[PDB]
Amino acid sequence: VSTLIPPKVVSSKNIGSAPNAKRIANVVHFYKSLPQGPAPAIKANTRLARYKAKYFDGDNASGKPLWHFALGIIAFGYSMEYYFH
Amino acid sequence: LTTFSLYTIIVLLVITSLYTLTNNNNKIIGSRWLISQEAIYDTIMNMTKGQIGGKNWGLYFPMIFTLFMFIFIANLISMIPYSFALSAHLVFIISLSIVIWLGNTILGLYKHGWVFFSLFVPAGTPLPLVPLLVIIETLSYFARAISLGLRLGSNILAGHLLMVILAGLTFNFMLINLFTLVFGFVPLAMILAIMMLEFAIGIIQGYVWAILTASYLKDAVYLH
Numbered sequence A: 001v002s003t004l005i006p007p008k009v010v011s012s013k014n015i016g017s018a019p020n021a022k023r024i025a026n027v028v029h030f031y032k033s034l035p036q037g038p039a040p041a042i043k044a045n046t047r048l049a050r051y052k053a054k055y056f057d058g059d060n061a062s063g064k065p066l067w068h069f070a071l072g073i074i075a076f077g078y079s080m081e082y083y084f085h
Numbered sequence B: 001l002t003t004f005s006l007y008t009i010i011v012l013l014v015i016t017s018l019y020t021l022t023n024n025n026n027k028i029i030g031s032r033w034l035i036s037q038e039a040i041y042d043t044i045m046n047m048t049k050g051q052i053g054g055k056n057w058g059l060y061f062p063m064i065f066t067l068f069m070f071i072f073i074a075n076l077i078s079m080i081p082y083s084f085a086l087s088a089h090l091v092f093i094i095s096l097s098i099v100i101w102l103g104n105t106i107l108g109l110y111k112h113g114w115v116f117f118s119l120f121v122p123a124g125t126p127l128p129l130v131p132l133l134v135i136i137e138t139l140s141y142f143a144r145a146i147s148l149g150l151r152l153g154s155n156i157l158a159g160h161l162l163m164v165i166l167a168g169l170t171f172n173f174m175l176i177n178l179f180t181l182v183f184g185f186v187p188l189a190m191i192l193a194i195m196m197l198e199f200a201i202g203i204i205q206g207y208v209w210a211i212l213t214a215s216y217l218k219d220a221v222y223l224h
Helices: A018-026 A049-054 A064-075 A077-081 B003-019 B032-052 B061-076 B091-120 B130-176 B185-221
Strands: none
Touching (some): A064 A077, A064 B003, B003 B032, B061 B185, B091 B185
């Protein structure tokens, strides 16, 4: 009876579609995300900070700390098993 | 501060410096230390489903985990020939078994009451066979609880003494033989083998203890 007009009705149509739900999701997931590894806090300073940078960081993550623990028992020979039970 | 207490302090000193003192990469990986415990954490978590699963497996997960951690750490540093391991008495391992059983029944008596006595008759065994089975079942409940504690501690005691007894023999061998060669490294070779066994058995027996204490929890929560 006349010229129908569904070419321009997306101003209220862009709310119910599924991609819009993902659209409003990931845009919030993007703006505050740190750009290039910023704010990594690589300078750890808490009590034994030196340990935090050699083995406690996790780059090595090997049996050295338990080796250090074992050597501590060895150095305590005349303190726990000798001169005492 | 007895030998038990100071050892217990050393346990927690090691405990924190494996996973609590890395805490820097803000990721699931970034330190092979993290991969270590989550491997153990996953092995026991899936085991918790396979043995306790169905209503409250994750509810009681930490006790099996904490006990497994406790036995695991106590068995790691136990090989050195001067390891006065757990005061050479190991009486607490019996005590841990006693309290674990004693808590197991109170949970059973709280959650079932008189129904807990129906656990002694699983499927059949009618009235002529009822007194025989309830005797076997109830005596068994005492039986494996005390057995669990004694087997772990005694073997740790057995392993520690077979460190020393063989060590004294090696001292005798290396002092008597003048110029030959095959007298001390072969006894040293057994020392190397018998120490790997003691280190190995502690790992699985901690697992066995973990599986067993899991197994008794099923019987308390679930009647069969």
